[PDB]
Amino acid sequence: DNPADILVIAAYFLLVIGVGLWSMCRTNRGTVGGYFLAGRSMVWWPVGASLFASNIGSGHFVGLAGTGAASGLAVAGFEWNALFVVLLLGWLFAPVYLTAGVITMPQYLRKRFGGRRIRLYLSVLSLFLYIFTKISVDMFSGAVFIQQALGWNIYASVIALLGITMIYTVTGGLAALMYTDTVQTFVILGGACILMGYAFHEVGGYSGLFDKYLGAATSLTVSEDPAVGNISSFCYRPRPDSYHLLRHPVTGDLPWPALLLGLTIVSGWYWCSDQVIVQRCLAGKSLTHIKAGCILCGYLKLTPMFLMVMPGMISRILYPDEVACVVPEVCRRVCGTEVGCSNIAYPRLVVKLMPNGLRGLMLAVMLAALMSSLASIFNSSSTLFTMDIYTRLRPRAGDRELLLVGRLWVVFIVVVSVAWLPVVQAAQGGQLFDYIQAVSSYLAPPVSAVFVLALFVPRVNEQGAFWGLIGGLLMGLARLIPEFSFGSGSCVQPSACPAFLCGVHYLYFAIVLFFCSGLLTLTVSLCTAPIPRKHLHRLVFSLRHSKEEREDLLEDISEDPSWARVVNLNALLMMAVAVFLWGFYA
């Protein structure tokens, strides 16, 4: 309502419109290549900025600050795992996807294994995973942020947000979102650093955070409800391993073996196997540029500890009776959620700490985060649907029809997400960010398993790869179904779920499920008749440098020696900095 906020939001919209108009004037959106793969013309800084911006949504502010508030700094693990896995994208996965000549990741499996059915299976599974693990988090965390910071209607505001991002997505191709993602990455980091600064000033520096956080308990630990009573000292007190990434392998909330192995498997899928991230790398002008983009994205994937997780911990320190409330009556009075109020951590810092001018900037940050993630999901899902499902139903379709079907799919997935908004608003508190990481850990590891076996084990054939994916979903669904049955509850009200099904951390189930899907794929592969070498040139990590005539069931990825040498040294320096920071907070 102060004019400075409205001018900052209009200035942000003018930046995004301006870069969109410039990209549309520059690039060709008349062809499938241009609109879905940016012309394969995207140099390193759009690729890095877009990898970052496609990933960091409103979920990262609300979820990582919230979980920061609730559980301390191990949740940085989600982000910091990414750092290692992006080097598997640029150096292992991205080269093979450039030599395969693929527009989609289901198409890669079509070329590698050769059935009609692995491509269709994976497209449909990918579309569900984007409704459940990507669109859900953006709608939900957007709606949290609006409820707390703005106070507007959390239906109408989400319809408006989903509708503006619809236009932003359909209007330009992959070249408009990736240039716009360079501005959105600048706004996200810029405004998020300014909030980090205000937060750290309020606790009295970095020393302030680490001497006040373990003391930051609520004073209201007695419920008016009988059979709740005096709340346990275990839940309202901060965890005494709050300052440690590497938490106890059986009793830790994020066990360290589960963080390192189990997140690498789920991050495997998310960064190396999944249309949303990999489209950014299928649009790079060459492999050196993809690799350089993968370095930038890695350094940006450090920033979320300092910009989201530690600010959420400062919110617990500053507003302990509101962010760290345990009494259901008090939590229902504070944010409307009986199971806790972690999720208000990030949007209370914006309300309480930001002056007249910068509240607007932090609204622009959440909008930049929300729009970049939602647009990237809509565009990738548009590509999946168009180029895998619609080219099945119409093979002789052609590049004008496929762009129209592409643009109408964005309208349909927006309408599906409006339909889905009440089911995601049924998630009560910080439960949702556990559900998304649980669903990612039950559906993604069989896909991680087939992509690693597709890329490194040429014996693995179509029967193996398909029956591994279906075996994989059967095991994943055993966990997912019985769980969601028993609910979550809270630490105050624990669920009646049987220890067996869920004592085991969901990221540990990721490791089991990966090796079981991989084992089933290898076993059914080794039983059934193999795929020979004439079917496999430039589709496997071995044969990415082949030049031989493939028989089907940009091809040249050799880069300048000097620029190769530069990006290879920068991958090693970025891993040293990663490893130092994991040691520092271990």
Binding site: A576, F580, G583, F584, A586
Partner: peptide, 29 residues
């Protein structure tokens, strides 16, 4: 000390990458 854990972590990582250059140099060529 956090700083010693950081430096020790980096030192172990530089040992592993030195091993990776050793193994591919002697066992791929």
């Amino acid at each position: 000390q956090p700083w010693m854990q950081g430096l020790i972590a980096v030192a172990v990582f530089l040992v592993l990458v030195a091993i990776a250059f050793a193994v591919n140099h002697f066992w791929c060529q």
